[PDB]
Automatic annotation (TrEMBL), chains A, C, F, G, H, L:
<feature type="binding site">
    <location>
        <position position="41"/>
    </location>
    <ligand>
        <name>Fe(3+)</name>
    </ligand>
</feature>
<dbReference type="InterPro" id="IPR012347">
    <property type="entry name" value="Ferritin-like"/>
</dbReference>
<feature type="binding site">
    <location>
        <position position="41"/>
    </location>
    <ligand>
        <name>Fe(2+) 1</name>
    </ligand>
</feature>
<keyword id="KW-0238">DNA-binding</keyword>
<dbReference type="GO" id="GO:0016722">
    <property type="term" value="F:oxidoreductase activity, acting on metal ions"/>
</dbReference>
<dbReference type="GO" id="GO:0008199">
    <property type="term" value="F:ferric iron binding"/>
</dbReference>
<dbReference type="GO" id="GO:0003677">
    <property type="term" value="F:DNA binding"/>
</dbReference>
<feature type="binding site">
    <location>
        <position position="68"/>
    </location>
    <ligand>
        <name>Fe(3+)</name>
    </ligand>
</feature>
<dbReference type="InterPro" id="IPR008331">
    <property type="entry name" value="Ferritin_DPS_dom"/>
</dbReference>
<feature type="binding site">
    <location>
        <position position="138"/>
    </location>
    <ligand>
        <name>Fe(2+) 2</name>
    </ligand>
</feature>
<dbReference type="InterPro" id="IPR002177">
    <property type="entry name" value="DPS_DNA-bd"/>
</dbReference>
<keyword id="KW-0479">Metal-binding</keyword>
<feature type="binding site">
    <location>
        <position position="138"/>
    </location>
    <ligand>
        <name>Mg(2+) 2</name>
    </ligand>
</feature>
<feature type="binding site">
    <location>
        <position position="57"/>
    </location>
    <ligand>
        <name>Fe(2+) 1</name>
    </ligand>
</feature>
<feature type="binding site">
    <location>
        <position position="48"/>
    </location>
    <ligand>
        <name>Mg(2+) 1</name>
    </ligand>
</feature>
<dbReference type="InterPro" id="IPR023188">
    <property type="entry name" value="DPS_DNA-bd_CS"/>
</dbReference>
<comment type="similarity">
    <text>Belongs to the Dps family.</text>
</comment>
Amino acid sequence: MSARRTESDIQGFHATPEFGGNLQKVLVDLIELSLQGKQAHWNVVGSNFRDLHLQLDELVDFAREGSDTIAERMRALDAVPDGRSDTVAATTTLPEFPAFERSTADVVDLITTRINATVDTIRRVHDAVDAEDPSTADLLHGLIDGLEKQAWLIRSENRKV
Amino acid sequence: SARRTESDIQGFHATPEFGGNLQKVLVDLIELSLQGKQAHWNVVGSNFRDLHLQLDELVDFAREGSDTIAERMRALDAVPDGRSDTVAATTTLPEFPAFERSTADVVDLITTRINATVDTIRRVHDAVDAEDPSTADLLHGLIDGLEKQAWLIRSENRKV
Amino acid sequence: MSARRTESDIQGFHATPEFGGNLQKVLVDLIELSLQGKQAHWNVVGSNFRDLHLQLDELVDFAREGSDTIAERMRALDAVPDGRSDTVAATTTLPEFPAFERSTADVVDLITTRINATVDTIRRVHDAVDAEDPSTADLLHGLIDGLEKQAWLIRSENRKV
Amino acid sequence: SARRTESDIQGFHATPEFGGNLQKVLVDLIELSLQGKQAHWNVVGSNFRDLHLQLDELVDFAREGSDTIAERMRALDAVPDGRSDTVAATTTLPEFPAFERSTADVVDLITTRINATVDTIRRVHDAVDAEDPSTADLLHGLIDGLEKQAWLIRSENRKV
Amino acid sequence: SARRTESDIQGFHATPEFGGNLQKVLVDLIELSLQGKQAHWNVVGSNFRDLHLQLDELVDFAREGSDTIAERMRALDAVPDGRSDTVAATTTLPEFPAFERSTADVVDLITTRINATVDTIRRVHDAVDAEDPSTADLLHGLIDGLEKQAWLIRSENRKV
Amino acid sequence: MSARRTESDIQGFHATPEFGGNLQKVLVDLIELSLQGKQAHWNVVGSNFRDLHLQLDELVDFAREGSDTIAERMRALDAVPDGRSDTVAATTTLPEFPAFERSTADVVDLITTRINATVDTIRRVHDAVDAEDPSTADLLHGLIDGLEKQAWLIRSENRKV
Amino acid sequence: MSARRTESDIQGFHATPEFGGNLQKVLVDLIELSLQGKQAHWNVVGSNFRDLHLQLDELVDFAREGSDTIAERMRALDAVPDGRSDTVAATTTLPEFPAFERSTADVVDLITTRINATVDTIRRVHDAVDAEDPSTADLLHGLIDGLEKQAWLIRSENRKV
Amino acid sequence: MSARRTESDIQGFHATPEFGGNLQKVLVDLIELSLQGKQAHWNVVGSNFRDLHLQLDELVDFAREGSDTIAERMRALDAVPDGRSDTVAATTTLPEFPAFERSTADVVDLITTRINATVDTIRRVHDAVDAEDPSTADLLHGLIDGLEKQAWLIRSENRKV
Amino acid sequence: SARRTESDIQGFHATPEFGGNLQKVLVDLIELSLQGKQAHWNVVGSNFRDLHLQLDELVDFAREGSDTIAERMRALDAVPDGRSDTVAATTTLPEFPAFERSTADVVDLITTRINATVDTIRRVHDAVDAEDPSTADLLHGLIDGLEKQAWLIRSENRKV
Amino acid sequence: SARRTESDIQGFHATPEFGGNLQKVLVDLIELSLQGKQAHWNVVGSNFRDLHLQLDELVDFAREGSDTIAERMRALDAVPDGRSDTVAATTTLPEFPAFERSTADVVDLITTRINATVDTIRRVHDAVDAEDPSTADLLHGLIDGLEKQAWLIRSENRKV
Amino acid sequence: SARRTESDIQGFHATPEFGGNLQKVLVDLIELSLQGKQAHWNVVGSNFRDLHLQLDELVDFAREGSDTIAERMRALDAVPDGRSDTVAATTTLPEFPAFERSTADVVDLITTRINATVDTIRRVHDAVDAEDPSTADLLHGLIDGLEKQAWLIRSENRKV
Amino acid sequence: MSARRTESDIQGFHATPEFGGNLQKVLVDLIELSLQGKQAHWNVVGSNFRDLHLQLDELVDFAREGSDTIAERMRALDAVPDGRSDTVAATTTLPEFPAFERSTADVVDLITTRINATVDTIRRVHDAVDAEDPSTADLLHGLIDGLEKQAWLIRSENRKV
Ligand SMILES: [Cl-]
Ligand SMILES: [Cl-]
Ligand SMILES: [Cl-]
Ligand SMILES: [Cl-]
Ligand SMILES: [Fe+2]
Ligand SMILES: [Fe+2]
Ligand SMILES: [Fe+2]
Ligand SMILES: [Fe+2]
Ligand SMILES: [Fe+2]
Ligand SMILES: [Fe+2]
Ligand SMILES: [Fe+2]
Ligand SMILES: [Fe+2]
Ligand SMILES: [Fe+2]
Ligand SMILES: [Fe+2]
Ligand SMILES: [Fe+2]
Ligand SMILES: [Fe+3]
Ligand SMILES: [Fe+3]
Ligand SMILES: [Fe+3]
Ligand SMILES: [Fe+3]
Ligand SMILES: [Fe+3]
Ligand SMILES: [Fe+3]
Ligand SMILES: [Fe+3]
Ligand SMILES: [Fe+3]
Ligand SMILES: [Fe+3]
Ligand SMILES: [Fe+3]
Ligand SMILES: [Fe+3]
Ligand SMILES: [Fe+3]
Ligand SMILES: [Mg+2]
Ligand SMILES: [Mg+2]
Ligand SMILES: [Mg+2]
Ligand SMILES: [Mg+2]
């Protein structure tokens, strides 16, 4: 037992209220993005429908995994997520997705904007998150990388050169 | 030759009532999936792991269900609305509470909200079946699947 | 505003005693079919042994999945299944499978008859089941379809010209 | 004690009219698969790849469907006819045109072909359902699956 | 040059008593699988899900075991009897009770059922081993597998 | 320095009308074979039903993959395939498959003959195809090999001693 | 304190010459069985061709895995296997497989006899093997079980009533 | 060769003795955690046994992969790990796991403490590791994230709300 | 016994001309793969996703092709050179441009460079076949595969 | 009815000697796995890759072996101790050295320690078999598997 | 209308000399597989593991090849003979020596055995190709595959 | 819409010219490493050929995935990669790989040097990359970790102790 600790209880790392709040901000924007992504997935019409239909689902898959990652990281650090519809609608920074069928050109521009809004949230909280817990900032890096890749893959459709 | 002479054959077009009924099912499925994930993250206490895992299975089913319904709407020329504001404003599900909740409370809460979702589907079933039996088959899959989830979840709280 | 319901307790669909009894009838015949299917699978000998041996296992797989489906549907609807050996033996409507080894030709005829008997049970209770709960009748449709396919795949061995 | 004592129990038998109704579905599903492959090979133009791929998915579904229908016929002791001459002579689908076709033209052509196939299934549905609800469930799967393909393909040409 | 010159060489033949010993194992394994499914459906209460799942794993093992035993009998030209009437009439397992049962009760009930099945295999072991060591190896697999299931299930009720 | 070519446009290999016609001949017989293979698969009854039912599906799988291979090779070489039902029926060299149910023995003989007919088409056009484009002749070799294997696996049922 | 052994070199279990010879006997009969199994697989014709063709390959798979198991057990125990064609032919106890095509019925009888011969070798050496090394006898039990199952699956084709 | 280096030998990054020591500290605690996790996995009894039994194996899987990651990162950086039993026992910071059967409630509390002790070690060395080699600190972030997730999943069992 | 008495049997040795011909094929395949990845990253505009994906498929094929050829060289005692300087200095492919390129331009550019690669293989084919038919079979796989890629890519730009 | 009338049938209970023998096997398997990983990380020199890989295979086997034995103990109501202090204090294996070791030295060292582990299993075998043949079958799997590993590893150092 | 009217159309028939040529290939492929396993078991020394593994890959390829050849014979109504006595009596391969062999010796021995097998295939190639080009394609696959194995194995002994 | 942004266009993060240049440097060295890795894979001969042959392909797999990662990260951040042969040859920092067959000993030393040169490039740009975009620095950490592991696995072959 030469180096063994003898404390009966050893407590885990507990996130500050500010840290919890910062992850909550990321969470709602990821959930909103998933919901808007599905809306776009269903209602997109026009030239190159299939590629967009498929790409939007890939985006939704990533945003959903992202939200679960963030929420569970909150839980791990003794913080409590709120991903309920009312909370997401009331607190998301994303511009609202319009109703009805939308052209592929419109959807490309709309979804690129909404991805960028989500990335912006993660980028805004990054430094405060990194200062408290570098391991969580790494999860944010995964999100930034994965989402900015989605934005490039989607926006490239509308690019005229 | 028995070949049809037409050049533009139109597909089955849903009435506004029919589209509206599927929209009702859609918002409750989306809400159930959001509440399912909330419960999944925030459940604590005796038998946490089983509940945490079962809730994810419920969510998987409700998400595939929502996609099934929304795409059936698209196939029949209806337009789904699964946006957060619409879901919050029109869902019939009792609101899921915030914060940590015990496994016993989560069992009760989620069972109620599953049953609420099933109730929506059962409520619209006959009007859907009357117009389009093929869509009612999709509703049957939903009823069967969710009622299975309700049984698997609620059995945790059953006394002898 | 809000369309949210306010009940703290919402109960599920509860099957009538009659409905539960009808599903129980289906259950015992499916279990009996599985048991007879395995008996035949082990004890068939003669021309085209292997094909029959293999097809019988496929039949057993389907009947087993079927029995679990029906019993679990019963549970979902607050009914209580009984698949115990004594109950199955005392209440199955299937003619009993004979003892000892049986020829391929005999097994084809015997098993076809027992599938037909199992399907007849499902078809007999169908309308009463459909009347109370159309979703369960859909499960019955899968059983009818799957079992009648097995009957075709098995019986065709004995059909001439 | 509840055991039936008859030595040979006969299975459910379909009327010959029921068989003929399924035969109508079969030929149109085979025709659809043949036209789908023709389109898959010969489609050219903007968004080639998506159409090339989507057409193969339609063919996959139509082939599985035709197998499902033919084997249901066999299960009920009807006898399918999927031979080229019979398909050509009895299909209700408008003929697919020869040569390379633009993606825009293929979208419209195939949507019509799918809609024709669905129409056949919808036309026979009630007579099939009256005799055998289990078979009508198979028709529902086909209606749902094909109408999904119609939506996925036609959306390419939709201007909003 | 070392080649044997007899045209038909007979395989190993098991005595009828050996066959009867394997038959004893078979009926208890089938009974166990039937009781395991009964428990799997009807178990309710705290830690439902784990028990529901563990019971299916036990049934899987018991079903594979019964197939193994019956096919070993066939290999040695014995003739298994796995019919419902025979199983009910000849199984040594205490009957499983009807109706919903609490998880605590199911744990104790099934542990006993597994222990009864293992006892049968242990009782016939030495006579089987004396005649055919290869068959006794199969019995070892069953003893090891079932006693593992007994431990996995009973541990739920163990208070320390 | 550099071995780089300087053309802004380099065209691909273009098949002669004759070459295209030869591949079209192969195509229709492969499609006809697939259609007859499925007909036989559904309608075979009698001794050893299951083996034949299963082998016929394997034959159909190969003929379908073959038809796609040939049609796509045509497209690669700027030829235009025609696999429409009317064309297949009007131009196939295969004897027509008979109507209604057929015995296992009959199906073995019928399908073997139709495979033989399909292979004969490929062998007849082979040298002309090989002369123009050896790479396509290699695809023909796979078809010959794969189909003659099917013929062996099917016909052996009817071969005595 | 410590229960650690202090030897710089600990040798493994070394098989007696007799033990090695007994495993060699098993090896050659397994290899011969694999070779005869393939011969039968290629050259069987007649009623129920396909089932036999397929089952024979399963038998060959098992006998090949068996030969590798025995030879490798020999190596583990410092014995040296000989699976060369000349040795197999000169020392196998199996009756030789006949030349040319053979009927399904003939192949069933021939192969059953050759499996029986292979198993007899294993059963003959068993007790001497078990006496020296019970772990190897366990490998022999798997071979006995697996091969006798093959014999049942193959022979049942020819068993009447 | 315009930007090409012309040195014959280019050496890799070599960890300092302090860095090597820091990774060694993480290594022994990960190995100890794996050993204690298995002990708990085997000996846990009582309410919700199966969930705990299973979760403990998941923990062990992660801790084992973690130890291999750390050890191989040491090797990559020209450091030498020591994961031997005596070294692990003598130098681990983890409180000793008790002997005998332990209740599920006890095991939850015990294992949460031991996970937290492991995380604490990684957190203690993090900044010194990050200052020398940010790429290694990233591997530490994976460990912190994965282990704190395990602690949340395990401790939630005992949480009364 | 028909056994050969030799102790050192040598393998088939390729002439320098033959090795040189395979080397020609190798550099154009490597160049095509590098150009394919450049296009894959830098393509933008209408139908981006399909092109981005198709280009990766082309690259996969050209890379497996390069390995096939280089290892065939090794098998026949020839020595491949796939180094960047050698590829740049000896490839016959027109240079792929830098910077972002439109989907329409990428279709045209990549089709030309695929056709250039196929041309190399077709140019050496007869001399390769004359010496070693087995190697010409590998060339056929390459011709077939790349000409398929050319068709899939160029069809995007085809007008009616 | 042949049904047993008991309500509480107990399972096979291992003697303290039997539990002690399995405990002996357990600590040597755990020690072998720890030494295997040490060797895996620290081996250098000629044929590094093969040895690095083979050592991981040995470790996988010894870890699954340790779990097999510990859980067999649990099944028979014995209590394993796999803790670091217990393993260090009671293992019979010669200590594996620290620091980098050559492939030649690693071959020799690991072969010795495998043989030591096999020796433990062979030492307890007869007493285990006498009490419970089913457990001795598990021991046979271990002997077979580890002796295979010894052969695969030591063959590296064998001279002609 | 283009349909042939003969009731039985005969398949392609191979001359008996063609059959004998394939028989020559078959025996050497079987011999190679048997020698490959012998080497795989009995190889010892530096780089044991890589040789042990590579030899199994060669055996895999030789076994698949022999199946390919025998089944091609069957397809063309030739009759293969793969019996031990025939293989031993008619193979052209130098006998593999008995006992343990060093990795260096095995490399040289097996390279020769592969080269002998390839030589047989190359010797019969032109007569096979003249009668049936489709069969010669199979021979090409074997030549390419075996010569790859020769390169992979022999490279171990290559000093540069 | 309480927290929702109302901007129609939200632009993504755009890499500076310096950042783009830094990633370009990493890209060319990864591509050069892949090309040299394949050259070594093909032309390596001598003792332990197979292990080296195989390990070199694993290296190539990682370097290829790395180059795609870097290039696509450039695209995501509105930078433009150049992975063309001429550019790679003209701008890589890697010492040239020699022509012809090379011994396994030579290849180990050569490839270790070239891996280290690639790692050095990534390490040289790391801090400038990290200062502008921490999420990209994380991708660099993956590359450093994965490549230094390859160097250890390869170089260990030549290590004499
Ligand atoms: Cl679980
Ligand atoms: Cl089969
Ligand atoms: Cl796609
Ligand atoms: Cl390897
Ligand atoms: Fe990371
Ligand atoms: Fe209905
Ligand atoms: Fe229905
Ligand atoms: Fe259904
Ligand atoms: Fe070919
Ligand atoms: Fe065993
Ligand atoms: Fe960082
Ligand atoms: Fe040729
Ligand atoms: Fe060829
Ligand atoms: Fe024994
Ligand atoms: Fe044993
Ligand atoms: Fe989750
Ligand atoms: Fe969708
Ligand atoms: Fe179930
Ligand atoms: Fe079918
Ligand atoms: Fe079975
Ligand atoms: Fe295609
Ligand atoms: Fe082996
Ligand atoms: Fe490792
Ligand atoms: Fe390679
Ligand atoms: Fe375990
Ligand atoms: Fe075969
Ligand atoms: Fe990419
Ligand atoms: Mg597209
Ligand atoms: Mg058969
Ligand atoms: Mg639980
Ligand atoms: Mg090696």
